[PDB]
């Protein structure tokens, strides 16, 4: 199937320039266009510009003309968007979207997963992970909530799995809070049978790609 996969999240200093990629696979070489749309936190989608790589054609919205440059390599079906003189107004999620046929289609059918670009002078910081032990019992299974506290990381986002994917449902990862220090913190908890915790070993795996950090933490009574 058609897949648009983007570069990861990144923190950039004010005045720097940022570059985001969008590789398309499964997508019928031809007159497709790659459009770049940004979304500030809690705001709406905003079209920035577009490229037709087969023709080398580019266009931009008036708000971003002169500051954004979109390039492409058809040989690897990859598009790039570079945005310069960054300020904190540019902190946003940046999506690539695709138009399959520029002559026939006038809408976006496929979207990338989005890359979050945070413009800040603060430094990247990996998270500290702590266990939230169940420490309680209800019945043979009854109720039991255990989890992991992912503390003091910057910037967003972090991903959390349980037992590297072996434990999948009844897991609940809460959205992060932004503390007064400018650092983020979240929690992720699983509800398992009370019998399990004598038997089974429970590990949470946190991935913070912006800092290239991975943390495994075992949750014991």
């Amino acid at each position: 199937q058609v897949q648009l996969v983007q570069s990861g999240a990144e923190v950039k200093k004010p005045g720097s320039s940022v570059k985001v990629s969008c590789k398309t696979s499964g997508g019928t070489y031809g007159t497709y266009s790659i459009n770049w749309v940004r979304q500030a936190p809690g705001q709406g989608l905003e079209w920035m510009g577009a490229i037709i790589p087969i023709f080398g054609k580019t266009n931009y919205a008036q708000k971003f003309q002169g500051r954004v440059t979109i390039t492409a390599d058809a040989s690897t079906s990859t598009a790039y968007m570079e945005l310069g003189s960054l300020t904190s107004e540019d902190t946003a999620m940046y999506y690539c979207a695709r138009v399959e046929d520029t002559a026939l289609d006038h809408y976006f059918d496929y979207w990338g997963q989005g890359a979050l670009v945070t413009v800040s002078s603060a430094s990247t910081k990996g998270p500290s992970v702590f266990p939230l032990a169940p420490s309680s019992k209800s019945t043979s299974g009854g109720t039991a909530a255990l989890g992991c506290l992912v503390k003091d990381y910057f910037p967003e986002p972090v991903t959390v799995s349980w037992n590297s994917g072996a434990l999948t449902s009844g897991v609940h990862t809460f959205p992060a809070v932004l503390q007064s220090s400018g650092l983020y913190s979240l929690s992720s908890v699983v509800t398992v049978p009370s019998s399990s915790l004598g038997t089974q070993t429970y590990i949470c795996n946190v991935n913070h790609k912006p800092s290239n950090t991975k943390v495994d933490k075992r949750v014991e009574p």
Binding site: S33, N35, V37, G44, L45, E46, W47, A50, I52, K57, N59, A61, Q62, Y95, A97, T102, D105, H106, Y107, F108, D109, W111, G112, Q113, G114, S128, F130, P131, L132, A133, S135, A145, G147, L149, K151, H172, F174, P175, A176, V177, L178, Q179, S180, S185, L186, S187, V189
Partner: protein, 213 residues
């Protein structure tokens, strides 16, 4: 050049019908029949719902229909379901290789059955206390409607410092969840007899309590 005009929010009960407007100019909406509509769930990429003012892509339920009159297009949702709660954005072609988006509309489905919140209070890990910190973690889940108020207590007394609470977020079962954190030094945690997380939902106040014991 400027964004298309959409209402900030629309609401309806399950089984009802709602409509979301999108007003542009003669140059984009009034000229082309290339209006598209995208749905965005919390924390995901947009999904195409009604390209070509009236057409549905395959897989999109027939409850979503599209309309246009003059400079204004409209997304109509019939038979509202809880799974429809999301941000909806309209988009219009505005000339060669040019598109303009609307500001977005938040769609919430009210009137679903009430659900009391599950509350779990976690004491500071002794690993964190070894690292000279203490964090009280109060997690609230499985409640509807999606709004609660959280208060913290030091043995009976309201504590308002070091408290950070998320906005409510939707779970995969169409219920809501949130979390609150109380930052304490190890000494403040050890010196008190107990700490309390009190969650209020639609007038009902429940609480959990942890102790240094």
């Amino acid at each position: 050049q400027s964004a298309l005009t959409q209402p900030r929010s629309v609401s309806g009960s399950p089984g009802q019908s709602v409509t979301i407007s999108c007003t542009g100019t003669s140059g984009d909406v009034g000229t082309y029949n290339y209006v598209s509509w995208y749905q965005q769930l919390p924390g995901k990429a947009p999904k195409l719902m009604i390209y070509d003012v009236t057409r549905r892509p395959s897989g999109v339920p027939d409850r979503f229909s599209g309309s246009k009159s003059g400079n204004t297009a409209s997304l109509t949702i019939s038979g509202l379901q809880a799974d429809d709660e999301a941000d909806y954005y309209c988009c219009s072609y505005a000339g060669t290789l040019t598109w303009v988006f609307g500001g977005g509309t938040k769609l919430t489905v009210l009137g679903q059955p009430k659900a009391a919140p599950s509350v779990t209070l976690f004491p500071p890990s002794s690993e964190e206390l070894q690292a000279n910190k203490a964090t009280l973690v109060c997690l609230i889940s499985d409640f509807y409607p999606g709004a609660v108020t959280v208060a913290w207590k030091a043995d009976s007394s309201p504590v308002k410092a070091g408290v950070e609470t998320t906005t409510p977020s939707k779970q995969s079962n169409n219920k809501y969840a949130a979390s609150s954190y109380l930052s304490l030094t190890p000494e403040q945690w050890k010196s008190h007899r107990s700490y309390s997380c009190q969650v209020t939902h639609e007038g009902s106040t429940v609480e959990k309590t942890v102790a240094p014991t």
